[PDB]
Structures are given as C-alpha cells and as structure tokens.
Structure 1
Amino acid sequence: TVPKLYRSVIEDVINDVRDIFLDDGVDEQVLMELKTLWENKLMENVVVCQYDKIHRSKNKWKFHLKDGIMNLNGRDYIFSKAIGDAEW
C-alpha cells in the first residue's frame, strides 16, 4: 500500500507539473528523467502527521492523528487515522 501510494503521488506530481515544464521551455524528456530519477532514488523513527485532537488527562495523553507517514524501523508506513495513547 505504501509503494502504491508513493507511485500515485509521483504520477500526480508528474501529471500536474507537465504544463509548467512545457511553459517555461524545458522539454518533457527532462520531465520523464525527473520521474525515473525520483522512482530510482525512492529505493530514527519519525512519524510526520497532522493532529486532530491531542487530549490530555492528568497524565494520560490521547492522540487522534490524521494523515501520516511514519518511518518505523527503516520501513515507511501510511495511516489515515492513528488513535494512540500514552502515559507521561
């Protein structure tokens, strides 16, 4: 799912900037080179997400997190919702 999502993002970005490349006067072969270079370059644990609600009791934290890309153990995972708990 993570590689499929990444491929979707790559294809969207390439499809949406094609016109700018055409406009400013750089050939679309540079665009395909960008796409293949990106796909090739594609091959600490950090979770980059958005927060829907960080609620906190006296010590108990409850995170409701939105769209996120985590990097756990060198492996990228994707989530649309992460409901985590913690105790400070």
Structure 2
Amino acid sequence: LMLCLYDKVTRTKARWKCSLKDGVVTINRNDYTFQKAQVEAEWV
C-alpha cells in the first residue's frame, strides 16, 4: 500500500503512468520516501 498523493496520470486505454508526490513507497521492509514518482504501469 503506497499511501501517496497523485498529480497527473496519463493513460490511453491500455497503460498507466501514475504521478506521485510527497508520499512513501513500501518495498522489502525499507520505505522509499520520494519527491516525485511516475508509476509507468501497463493494463491487461
């Protein structure tokens, strides 16, 4: 669970790029505190 705040997410029906700012990322027991994150995900 990445409890962050979004800024601008761009998508054309098959892909996600999730802008994240002033939030945290929780992976492998180490928290990732980031200024700006862009989740360039893909949609099935």
Structure 1: where are the runs of 5+ without partners? Answer: 1-45
Secondary structure at the counterpart of residue 80 of structure 1: strand
Normalising by structure 2, we get a TM-score of 0.78
Uncovered stretches (5+) of structure 2, i.e. residues with no partner: none
- RMSD over aligned Cα atoms: 1.1
Q: Note the alpha carbon deviations across 1:31-57, whole angstroms, 9 max, x for none.
A: xxxxxxxxxxxxxxx211100012211
Establish whether residue 57 from structure 1 lines up as the match of residue 2 from structure 2.
no
Q: Percent identity?
A: 49
Match of 1:83 in 2: 38
Structure 1 runs of 4+ aligned residues shifted over 4 Å read: none
Separation of aligned partners in 2, 1:85 and 1:70: 15
Matched residue count: 43
Q: Which has the higher helix share?
A: 1
Give 1:87 shift.
0.8
Q: Which has the higher strand share?
A: 2
The structure whose RCO (Cα within 8 Å, separation 6+) is larger is: 2
